[PDB]
Every structure is written in C-alpha cells, then in structure tokens.
Symmetry: D2
Subunit: 115 residues, 4 copies
C-alpha cells in the first residue's frame, strides 16, 4: 500500500467516515488525469488506492470532498474540498500517508513519507 489517506473530524473527535476523495495525476500535457478514488472506512482510512507498479513518479493531487461531509452533518463549510498536491517517487519508490484534520472553516494536512 504505497498511498494511504487518513481523515479526522476535529468537531466530533472521530475518524471522518465515508469521506469521498479523488486522486489525479498530472499528464504530459499539464492536465489532471484521473488516477484513483475511494471513500474512507469507519477508521477514517482509505487503503488500496494504488499499487507499487502503478504509482510511478509524477505530480499527484488528492481532492478530499470535505464539503459533502460537512453538509451531511448540517454544517455549511468554507472549503469546496481539501486539496493535497505533491511530487511522488522522484527519488525512487516511497510509501505515503496523507492525513487531514477537518473543521468547518479550517483544515490541517500532513504527510508521512517512508522508504
């Protein structure tokens, strides 16, 4: 599992469950190509987005649908989504965990990169 995303809810003190996200990869023509997508589990984690073979060097974007998450709880949030854009694997294969901590008007995101 070279790419995992974990999402936490700062209002309820819980994993952010059933949060949709889409991953894109920048194509040679500078456009964003669909790469993978999924929803977080009851643990707030999304595993199995990609494989070592498929997850080549490139610029990737994870777009987390935070707006639908808050709206389902009856909250009108600030952001359309939380976005994480990064170059991956340019020095060889790495494992990436992207974490996001969500509030209605704020988010924090970090990465853990391991060899």
């Amino acid at each position: 599992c070279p790419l995992m995303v974990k999402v936490l809810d700062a209002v309820r003190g819980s994993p952010a469950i059933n949060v949709a996200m889409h991953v894109f990869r920048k194509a040679a023509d500078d456009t964003w190509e669909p790469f993978a997508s999924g929803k977080t589990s009851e643990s707030g984690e999304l595993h199995g987005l990609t494989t070592e073979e498929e997850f080549v060097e490139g610029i990737y974007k994870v777009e987390i649908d935070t707006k639908s998450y808050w709206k389902a709880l009856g909250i009108s949030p600030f952001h359309e989504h939380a976005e994480v854009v990064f170059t991956a694997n340019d020095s060889g294969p790495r494992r990436y965990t992207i974490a996001a901590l969500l509030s209605p008007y704020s988010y924090s995101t970090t990465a853990v990169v391991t060899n």
Copy 2:
C-alpha cells in the same frame, strides 16, 4: 478588504515573506480563470487582491507557491503548493481573511469570514 491572505512560517516562527500566490475563479466550463495575484509583504500579508464590486459569487482557488518558499531556505518540501478552494459571496459580499501556517511537510489553513 474583501480578500486578504496571511501566511506564517511554523519552522522559523515568523511571517512568511515574499510568498507568491495566484487566485483563480472557476469558469462556467469548469476551467480556472485568472482572478488576482501577488506576494506577501514583510508582515506575511497580501492585501489589495480585489475590490468589493469585482468579487462576486464564484468558486475561488488561492494557489500559494509554498514550494519556492521552502526551496529558497534549502528545504525540500512535500507540497507543490498550498491551495484553498472555497465559494465566496454566495450570500452577497463578505470580507475574507485566509490564513495559512506552513511547514515543510504540512500546512494548516483557516478562514475568517465577516459581514
């Protein structure tokens, strides 16, 4: 000030000075139209991006070039940029302050929205 952006450096405990950013507005064809841009001042702030009359309902994206900021400090960062995507002015004019707190592998962002 209809739209102000404030950027802080979590490594050095300082405003993030000379940080470049572009602001885009989503067009009817889902493309990102240029809207505003600038660099942060010595206080870490970017004022004067737009005027009340020009800043109407839309989806806006602030794309902050955090990568160049860290590279100038000899730090290889995780993100290509920090991006903040939000609907603005859907209930008429508001004043928006977007804050971003930067680390090499992480960023936090919040909004203050005032009537």
Copy 3:
C-alpha cells in the same frame, strides 16, 4: 506589544471573542506564579498583557479557557483548556504573538517571535 494572543474559531470562521486566559511564569520552586490575564476582544486579540520591562527571561504558560468558550456555544469540547508553554526573553527582549485556532476536539497554536 511584548506579548499578544490571537484566538480564532475554526467552526464558525470568526475571531474567538471573549475568550478568557491567564498567563503564569514559572517560579524558582517550579510552581506557576500569576503573571498576566485578560479576555480576547471582538477581533479575537488580547493586547496589553505586559510591558517590555516586566517581561524578562522565564518559562511562561498561557492557559486559554477554551472549555468555557465551547460550552457557551452548546458544544461539549475535549480539552479543559489550551495551554502554550514557552521560554521567553532568554536572548533579551522579543515581541511574541501567540495564535490559537480552536475546534471542539482539537487546537493548533503557533508563535511569531520578532526582534
């Protein structure tokens, strides 16, 4: 301003107004001696805590009553308070801005230290 504290609300996208805090300074016997206190203004800021002459080397603790803030909004929060503990003025006077971004189950804090 030798010491200023700014508090933001990540749920409502606003300054956190009327947030009470006390500041303590560590005594030689490791107890916390009262040093300063106040409540945030309508801008979420607390100015005038100390003067340059009074604010000398020491370990300081800002204890922000976040629990009362959330309870006034009908929200049961996680923390009893947010606390920020730091050495100040060990290289002579500096100006300190402490920022705190509050959610019910989370807080973020940063410092801006200027000569």
Copy 4:
C-alpha cells in the same frame, strides 16, 4: 488500550520517534499526580500507557517533551512541551487517541474518542 498517543513530525514528514511524554492525573487536592509515561516507537506511537481498570474518570494531562526532540535535531524550538489536558471517562469508559503534529514554532493536536 484505552489511551494511545501518536506524534508526527511536520518538518521531516515522518513519525516523531523516541519522543518522551508524561501523563498526569489531577488529584483530589488539585495537584498533578504522576500517572504514566513512555516514549514513542518507530511508528510515532506510544501504546500501553494504562489499562481499563486504572484509567478511571478524571482530569488528565499529557505533557509531550517536544523541546528535547527538536534540540536533538539541532533546532531551538519555541515550546517547552506540547500539553493536552482533558476530562476522561466521565460518561463511562472510552478509548482515546491523542495525536500531535509538531513543528519548531507550532503544534496541532486532536483527539479521537471512541466507545
């Protein structure tokens, strides 16, 4: 495992390894009694601090020694420690994960509380 602490490094994009922390519980005389302590593993996690039987209702403080962590990396950080103070188990037993994301001049902390 009713209490777990996870610590992440926002500068290096890694778990924060070998971070010491001390847990205290408020005694009947309002003093902080030692409760447990430990160091984070290679995953940045500290497990096994307590048991269901021992982790009674109370006010608890987790004091994470962030200063020693940064100093070992040659960084002079702002905070003496990152502190998390909270009431636990007052509505019956819960499982708590405390997470902290560390930078030299900033930290973010959140809690995941599960039944």
